[PDB]
Subunit: 161 residues, 12 copies
Amino acid sequence: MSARRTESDIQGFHATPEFGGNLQKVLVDLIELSLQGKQAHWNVVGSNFRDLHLQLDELVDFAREGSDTIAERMRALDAVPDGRSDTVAATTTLPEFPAFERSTADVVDLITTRINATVDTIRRVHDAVDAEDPSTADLLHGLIDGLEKQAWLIRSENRKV
Amino acid sequence: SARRTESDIQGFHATPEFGGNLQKVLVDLIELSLQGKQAHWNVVGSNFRDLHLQLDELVDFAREGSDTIAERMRALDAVPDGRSDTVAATTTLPEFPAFERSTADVVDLITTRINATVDTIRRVHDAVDAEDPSTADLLHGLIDGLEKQAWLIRSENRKV
Amino acid sequence: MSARRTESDIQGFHATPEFGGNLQKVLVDLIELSLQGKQAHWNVVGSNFRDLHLQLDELVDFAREGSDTIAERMRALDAVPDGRSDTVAATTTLPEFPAFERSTADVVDLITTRINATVDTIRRVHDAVDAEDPSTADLLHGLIDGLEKQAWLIRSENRKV
Amino acid sequence: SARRTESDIQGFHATPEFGGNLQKVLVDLIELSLQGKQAHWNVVGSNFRDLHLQLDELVDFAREGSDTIAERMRALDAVPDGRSDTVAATTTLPEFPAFERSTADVVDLITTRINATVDTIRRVHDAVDAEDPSTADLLHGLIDGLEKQAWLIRSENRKV
Amino acid sequence: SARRTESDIQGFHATPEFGGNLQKVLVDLIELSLQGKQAHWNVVGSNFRDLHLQLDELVDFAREGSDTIAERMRALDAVPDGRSDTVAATTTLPEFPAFERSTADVVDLITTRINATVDTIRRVHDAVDAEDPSTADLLHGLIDGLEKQAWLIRSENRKV
Amino acid sequence: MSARRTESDIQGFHATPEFGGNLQKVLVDLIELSLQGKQAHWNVVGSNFRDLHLQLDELVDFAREGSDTIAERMRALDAVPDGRSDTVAATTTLPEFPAFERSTADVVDLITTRINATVDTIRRVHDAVDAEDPSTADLLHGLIDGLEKQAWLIRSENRKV
Amino acid sequence: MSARRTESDIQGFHATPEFGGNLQKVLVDLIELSLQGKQAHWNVVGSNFRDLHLQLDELVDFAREGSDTIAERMRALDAVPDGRSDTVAATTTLPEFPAFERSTADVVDLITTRINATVDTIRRVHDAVDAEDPSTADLLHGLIDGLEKQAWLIRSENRKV
Amino acid sequence: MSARRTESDIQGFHATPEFGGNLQKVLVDLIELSLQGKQAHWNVVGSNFRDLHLQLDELVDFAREGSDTIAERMRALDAVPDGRSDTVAATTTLPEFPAFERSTADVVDLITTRINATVDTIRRVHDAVDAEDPSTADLLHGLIDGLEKQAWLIRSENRKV
Amino acid sequence: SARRTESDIQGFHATPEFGGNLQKVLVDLIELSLQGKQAHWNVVGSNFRDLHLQLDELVDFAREGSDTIAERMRALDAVPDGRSDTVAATTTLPEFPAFERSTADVVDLITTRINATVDTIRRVHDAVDAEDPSTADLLHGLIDGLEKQAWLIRSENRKV
Amino acid sequence: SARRTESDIQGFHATPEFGGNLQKVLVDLIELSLQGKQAHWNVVGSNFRDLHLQLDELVDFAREGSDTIAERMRALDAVPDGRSDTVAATTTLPEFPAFERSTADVVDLITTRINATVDTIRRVHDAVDAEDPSTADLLHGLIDGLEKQAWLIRSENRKV
Amino acid sequence: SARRTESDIQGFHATPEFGGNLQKVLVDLIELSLQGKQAHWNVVGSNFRDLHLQLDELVDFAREGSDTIAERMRALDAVPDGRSDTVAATTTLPEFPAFERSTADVVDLITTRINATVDTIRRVHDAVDAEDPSTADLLHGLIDGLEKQAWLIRSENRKV
Amino acid sequence: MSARRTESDIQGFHATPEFGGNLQKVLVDLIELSLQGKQAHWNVVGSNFRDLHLQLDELVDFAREGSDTIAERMRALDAVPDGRSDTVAATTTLPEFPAFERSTADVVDLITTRINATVDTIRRVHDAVDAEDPSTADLLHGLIDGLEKQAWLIRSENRKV
Ligand SMILES: [Cl-]
Ligand SMILES: [Cl-]
Ligand SMILES: [Cl-]
Ligand SMILES: [Cl-]
Ligand SMILES: [Fe+2]
Ligand SMILES: [Fe+2]
Ligand SMILES: [Fe+2]
Ligand SMILES: [Fe+2]
Ligand SMILES: [Fe+2]
Ligand SMILES: [Fe+2]
Ligand SMILES: [Fe+2]
Ligand SMILES: [Fe+2]
Ligand SMILES: [Fe+2]
Ligand SMILES: [Fe+2]
Ligand SMILES: [Fe+2]
Ligand SMILES: [Fe+3]
Ligand SMILES: [Fe+3]
Ligand SMILES: [Fe+3]
Ligand SMILES: [Fe+3]
Ligand SMILES: [Fe+3]
Ligand SMILES: [Fe+3]
Ligand SMILES: [Fe+3]
Ligand SMILES: [Fe+3]
Ligand SMILES: [Fe+3]
Ligand SMILES: [Fe+3]
Ligand SMILES: [Fe+3]
Ligand SMILES: [Fe+3]
Ligand SMILES: [Mg+2]
Ligand SMILES: [Mg+2]
Ligand SMILES: [Mg+2]
Ligand SMILES: [Mg+2]
């Protein structure tokens, strides 16, 4: 037992209220993005429908995994997520997705904007998150990388050169 | 030759009532999936792991269900609305509470909200079946699947 | 505003005693079919042994999945299944499978008859089941379809010209 | 004690009219698969790849469907006819045109072909359902699956 | 040059008593699988899900075991009897009770059922081993597998 | 320095009308074979039903993959395939498959003959195809090999001693 | 304190010459069985061709895995296997497989006899093997079980009533 | 060769003795955690046994992969790990796991403490590791994230709300 | 016994001309793969996703092709050179441009460079076949595969 | 009815000697796995890759072996101790050295320690078999598997 | 209308000399597989593991090849003979020596055995190709595959 | 819409010219490493050929995935990669790989040097990359970790102790 600790209880790392709040901000924007992504997935019409239909689902898959990652990281650090519809609608920074069928050109521009809004949230909280817990900032890096890749893959459709 | 002479054959077009009924099912499925994930993250206490895992299975089913319904709407020329504001404003599900909740409370809460979702589907079933039996088959899959989830979840709280 | 319901307790669909009894009838015949299917699978000998041996296992797989489906549907609807050996033996409507080894030709005829008997049970209770709960009748449709396919795949061995 | 004592129990038998109704579905599903492959090979133009791929998915579904229908016929002791001459002579689908076709033209052509196939299934549905609800469930799967393909393909040409 | 010159060489033949010993194992394994499914459906209460799942794993093992035993009998030209009437009439397992049962009760009930099945295999072991060591190896697999299931299930009720 | 070519446009290999016609001949017989293979698969009854039912599906799988291979090779070489039902029926060299149910023995003989007919088409056009484009002749070799294997696996049922 | 052994070199279990010879006997009969199994697989014709063709390959798979198991057990125990064609032919106890095509019925009888011969070798050496090394006898039990199952699956084709 | 280096030998990054020591500290605690996790996995009894039994194996899987990651990162950086039993026992910071059967409630509390002790070690060395080699600190972030997730999943069992 | 008495049997040795011909094929395949990845990253505009994906498929094929050829060289005692300087200095492919390129331009550019690669293989084919038919079979796989890629890519730009 | 009338049938209970023998096997398997990983990380020199890989295979086997034995103990109501202090204090294996070791030295060292582990299993075998043949079958799997590993590893150092 | 009217159309028939040529290939492929396993078991020394593994890959390829050849014979109504006595009596391969062999010796021995097998295939190639080009394609696959194995194995002994 | 942004266009993060240049440097060295890795894979001969042959392909797999990662990260951040042969040859920092067959000993030393040169490039740009975009620095950490592991696995072959 030469180096063994003898404390009966050893407590885990507990996130500050500010840290919890910062992850909550990321969470709602990821959930909103998933919901808007599905809306776009269903209602997109026009030239190159299939590629967009498929790409939007890939985006939704990533945003959903992202939200679960963030929420569970909150839980791990003794913080409590709120991903309920009312909370997401009331607190998301994303511009609202319009109703009805939308052209592929419109959807490309709309979804690129909404991805960028989500990335912006993660980028805004990054430094405060990194200062408290570098391991969580790494999860944010995964999100930034994965989402900015989605934005490039989607926006490239509308690019005229 | 028995070949049809037409050049533009139109597909089955849903009435506004029919589209509206599927929209009702859609918002409750989306809400159930959001509440399912909330419960999944925030459940604590005796038998946490089983509940945490079962809730994810419920969510998987409700998400595939929502996609099934929304795409059936698209196939029949209806337009789904699964946006957060619409879901919050029109869902019939009792609101899921915030914060940590015990496994016993989560069992009760989620069972109620599953049953609420099933109730929506059962409520619209006959009007859907009357117009389009093929869509009612999709509703049957939903009823069967969710009622299975309700049984698997609620059995945790059953006394002898 | 809000369309949210306010009940703290919402109960599920509860099957009538009659409905539960009808599903129980289906259950015992499916279990009996599985048991007879395995008996035949082990004890068939003669021309085209292997094909029959293999097809019988496929039949057993389907009947087993079927029995679990029906019993679990019963549970979902607050009914209580009984698949115990004594109950199955005392209440199955299937003619009993004979003892000892049986020829391929005999097994084809015997098993076809027992599938037909199992399907007849499902078809007999169908309308009463459909009347109370159309979703369960859909499960019955899968059983009818799957079992009648097995009957075709098995019986065709004995059909001439 | 509840055991039936008859030595040979006969299975459910379909009327010959029921068989003929399924035969109508079969030929149109085979025709659809043949036209789908023709389109898959010969489609050219903007968004080639998506159409090339989507057409193969339609063919996959139509082939599985035709197998499902033919084997249901066999299960009920009807006898399918999927031979080229019979398909050509009895299909209700408008003929697919020869040569390379633009993606825009293929979208419209195939949507019509799918809609024709669905129409056949919808036309026979009630007579099939009256005799055998289990078979009508198979028709529902086909209606749902094909109408999904119609939506996925036609959306390419939709201007909003 | 070392080649044997007899045209038909007979395989190993098991005595009828050996066959009867394997038959004893078979009926208890089938009974166990039937009781395991009964428990799997009807178990309710705290830690439902784990028990529901563990019971299916036990049934899987018991079903594979019964197939193994019956096919070993066939290999040695014995003739298994796995019919419902025979199983009910000849199984040594205490009957499983009807109706919903609490998880605590199911744990104790099934542990006993597994222990009864293992006892049968242990009782016939030495006579089987004396005649055919290869068959006794199969019995070892069953003893090891079932006693593992007994431990996995009973541990739920163990208070320390 | 550099071995780089300087053309802004380099065209691909273009098949002669004759070459295209030869591949079209192969195509229709492969499609006809697939259609007859499925007909036989559904309608075979009698001794050893299951083996034949299963082998016929394997034959159909190969003929379908073959038809796609040939049609796509045509497209690669700027030829235009025609696999429409009317064309297949009007131009196939295969004897027509008979109507209604057929015995296992009959199906073995019928399908073997139709495979033989399909292979004969490929062998007849082979040298002309090989002369123009050896790479396509290699695809023909796979078809010959794969189909003659099917013929062996099917016909052996009817071969005595 | 410590229960650690202090030897710089600990040798493994070394098989007696007799033990090695007994495993060699098993090896050659397994290899011969694999070779005869393939011969039968290629050259069987007649009623129920396909089932036999397929089952024979399963038998060959098992006998090949068996030969590798025995030879490798020999190596583990410092014995040296000989699976060369000349040795197999000169020392196998199996009756030789006949030349040319053979009927399904003939192949069933021939192969059953050759499996029986292979198993007899294993059963003959068993007790001497078990006496020296019970772990190897366990490998022999798997071979006995697996091969006798093959014999049942193959022979049942020819068993009447 | 315009930007090409012309040195014959280019050496890799070599960890300092302090860095090597820091990774060694993480290594022994990960190995100890794996050993204690298995002990708990085997000996846990009582309410919700199966969930705990299973979760403990998941923990062990992660801790084992973690130890291999750390050890191989040491090797990559020209450091030498020591994961031997005596070294692990003598130098681990983890409180000793008790002997005998332990209740599920006890095991939850015990294992949460031991996970937290492991995380604490990684957190203690993090900044010194990050200052020398940010790429290694990233591997530490994976460990912190994965282990704190395990602690949340395990401790939630005992949480009364 | 028909056994050969030799102790050192040598393998088939390729002439320098033959090795040189395979080397020609190798550099154009490597160049095509590098150009394919450049296009894959830098393509933008209408139908981006399909092109981005198709280009990766082309690259996969050209890379497996390069390995096939280089290892065939090794098998026949020839020595491949796939180094960047050698590829740049000896490839016959027109240079792929830098910077972002439109989907329409990428279709045209990549089709030309695929056709250039196929041309190399077709140019050496007869001399390769004359010496070693087995190697010409590998060339056929390459011709077939790349000409398929050319068709899939160029069809995007085809007008009616 | 042949049904047993008991309500509480107990399972096979291992003697303290039997539990002690399995405990002996357990600590040597755990020690072998720890030494295997040490060797895996620290081996250098000629044929590094093969040895690095083979050592991981040995470790996988010894870890699954340790779990097999510990859980067999649990099944028979014995209590394993796999803790670091217990393993260090009671293992019979010669200590594996620290620091980098050559492939030649690693071959020799690991072969010795495998043989030591096999020796433990062979030492307890007869007493285990006498009490419970089913457990001795598990021991046979271990002997077979580890002796295979010894052969695969030591063959590296064998001279002609 | 283009349909042939003969009731039985005969398949392609191979001359008996063609059959004998394939028989020559078959025996050497079987011999190679048997020698490959012998080497795989009995190889010892530096780089044991890589040789042990590579030899199994060669055996895999030789076994698949022999199946390919025998089944091609069957397809063309030739009759293969793969019996031990025939293989031993008619193979052209130098006998593999008995006992343990060093990795260096095995490399040289097996390279020769592969080269002998390839030589047989190359010797019969032109007569096979003249009668049936489709069969010669199979021979090409074997030549390419075996010569790859020769390169992979022999490279171990290559000093540069 | 309480927290929702109302901007129609939200632009993504755009890499500076310096950042783009830094990633370009990493890209060319990864591509050069892949090309040299394949050259070594093909032309390596001598003792332990197979292990080296195989390990070199694993290296190539990682370097290829790395180059795609870097290039696509450039695209995501509105930078433009150049992975063309001429550019790679003209701008890589890697010492040239020699022509012809090379011994396994030579290849180990050569490839270790070239891996280290690639790692050095990534390490040289790391801090400038990290200062502008921490999420990209994380991708660099993956590359450093994965490549230094390859160097250890390869170089260990030549290590004499
Ligand atoms: Cl679980
Ligand atoms: Cl089969
Ligand atoms: Cl796609
Ligand atoms: Cl390897
Ligand atoms: Fe990371
Ligand atoms: Fe209905
Ligand atoms: Fe229905
Ligand atoms: Fe259904
Ligand atoms: Fe070919
Ligand atoms: Fe065993
Ligand atoms: Fe960082
Ligand atoms: Fe040729
Ligand atoms: Fe060829
Ligand atoms: Fe024994
Ligand atoms: Fe044993
Ligand atoms: Fe989750
Ligand atoms: Fe969708
Ligand atoms: Fe179930
Ligand atoms: Fe079918
Ligand atoms: Fe079975
Ligand atoms: Fe295609
Ligand atoms: Fe082996
Ligand atoms: Fe490792
Ligand atoms: Fe390679
Ligand atoms: Fe375990
Ligand atoms: Fe075969
Ligand atoms: Fe990419
Ligand atoms: Mg597209
Ligand atoms: Mg058969
Ligand atoms: Mg639980
Ligand atoms: Mg090696």
